[PDB]
Amino acid sequence: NFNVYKATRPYLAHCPDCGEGHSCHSPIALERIRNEATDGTLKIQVSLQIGIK
Amino acid sequence: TLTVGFTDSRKISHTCTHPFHHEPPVIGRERFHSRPQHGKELPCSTYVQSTAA
Amino acid sequence: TDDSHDWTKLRYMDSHTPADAERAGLLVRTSAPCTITGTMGHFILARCPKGETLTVGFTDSRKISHTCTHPFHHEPPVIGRERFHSRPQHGKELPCSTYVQSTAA
Amino acid sequence: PGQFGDIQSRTPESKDVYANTQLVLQRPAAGTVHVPYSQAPSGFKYWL
Amino acid sequence: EYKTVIPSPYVKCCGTAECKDKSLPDYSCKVFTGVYPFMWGGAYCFCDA
Amino acid sequence: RVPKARNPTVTYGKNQVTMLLYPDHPTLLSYRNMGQEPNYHEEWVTHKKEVTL
């Protein structure tokens, strides 16, 4: 169960609003955003990964 | 808009902010706010909690 | 209470006593909690969402949160022709007017 | 353009797709390492 | 509902890249000059113009 | 940095023009002539609207 992310690492990317008004390279820059389900659920594609150490 | 953020091991939170016009697609003929106890049944579409796809 | 320059403590009066608290104690909101940039002297500079009210608070040395509000309607004026959303990737360079972080004006 | 049926398929499994959307690229600026494009307006998400 | 896919964009510094024509669903390509990327260590490339 | 707007789709008729236009945020539109009079006109717009000119 769930061993597919053994060749991954995060994706430092230029987020346009990192607070502070102006922009910066964050490790949590959003990349793609899907909401195609009719039930108001937001499927967020972020850079970093979770769970896997 | 949309904000996603967390705090690093350096105790410095990042918060990235993306302009995203979230608008709930209205279901049925009532523009309600939250589903109450006394409801009918209409077809809709969501995301399951599975891992493999 | 000894004319310090730290980024930790802050004075407040209590029965002829300047006492100290922390910057994490204070908090500001209008609809959502704002975000804090400029902290000096009597003066606090924030950026904050679309405002009906304003509320400011801090917490005691006895941890009692003194938090009170002020009536003021805050609307950021538009820039350009577009009632816009936030600052995006595409920006045209249009003039504006902001405070700076010079602690000695 | 800008209508449901901007993209078209004959079956749910037709890999041959018809498209009419005009994803027109724009000029990126200094430091702005990304791809700027004319957004294609959807068909569904306002046709709903 | 469709899906716009772009890959990561190609960069040719000390050089000038050019497309390859390909029967894609709304193939749209363009090479831009005078650009100047920024990353961790400033510019990704060495020269500017 | 102010946002730009998305280029709208446009076609022509015999000595007229129909422009179908897509906002996301509340956005102005204006138009005028270059003759002796401007015949200046403007509208706010918020939804995906067509206009004839």
From Swiss-Prot, chain A:
Annotated membrane topology: Single-pass type I membrane protein
Post-translational modification: Palmitoylated via thioester bonds. These palmitoylations may induce disruption of the C-terminus transmembrane. This would result in the reorientation of E2 C-terminus from lumenal to cytoplasmic side.
Annotated region described as Interaction with host Mxra8 receptor, given as residue ranges: 22-25
Subcellular location(s) per record: Virion membrane; Host cell membrane
Cystines in this chain: 18-24
Described function: Plays a role in viral attachment to target host cell, by binding to the cell receptor MXRA8. Synthesized as a p62 precursor which is processed by furin at the cell membrane just before virion budding, giving rise to E2-E1 heterodimer. The p62-E1 heterodimer is stable, whereas E2-E1 is unstable and dissociate at low pH. p62 is processed at the last step, presumably to avoid E1 fusion activation before its final export to cell surface.
Subunit structure: Interacts with spike glycoprotein E1. Processing of the precursor of protein E3/E2 into E2 and E3 results in a heterodimer of the spike glycoproteins E2 and E1. Spike at virion surface are constituted of a trimer of E2-E1 heterodimers. Interacts with 6K protein. Interacts with host MXRA8; this interaction mediates virus entry. The interaction involves 2 adjacent E2-E1 heterodimers.
The protein, known as: Spike glycoprotein E2
Swiss-Prot record, chain B:
Membrane topology of this protein: Single-pass type I membrane protein
PTMs per UniProt: Palmitoylated via thioester bonds. These palmitoylations may induce disruption of the C-terminus transmembrane. This would result in the reorientation of E2 C-terminus from lumenal to cytoplasmic side. N-glycosylated.
Compartmental location: Virion membrane; Host cell membrane
Assembly: Interacts with spike glycoprotein E1. Processing of the precursor of protein E3/E2 into E2 and E3 results in a heterodimer of the spike glycoproteins E2 and E1. Spike at virion surface are constituted of a trimer of E2-E1 heterodimers. Interacts with 6K protein. Interacts with host MXRA8; this interaction mediates virus entry. The interaction involves 2 adjacent E2-E1 heterodimers.
UniProt function note: Plays a role in viral attachment to target host cell, by binding to the cell receptor MXRA8. Synthesized as a p62 precursor which is processed by furin at the cell membrane just before virion budding, giving rise to E2-E1 heterodimer. The p62-E1 heterodimer is stable, whereas E2-E1 is unstable and dissociate at low pH. p62 is processed at the last step, presumably to avoid E1 fusion activation before its final export to cell surface.
Protein name: Spike glycoprotein E2
Species assigned in the record: Chikungunya virus (strain 37997) (CHIKV)
Lineage summary: Viruses, Riboviria, Orthornavirae, Kitrinoviricota, Alsuviricetes
Shown segment, full-protein numbering: 435 to 487 of 1248
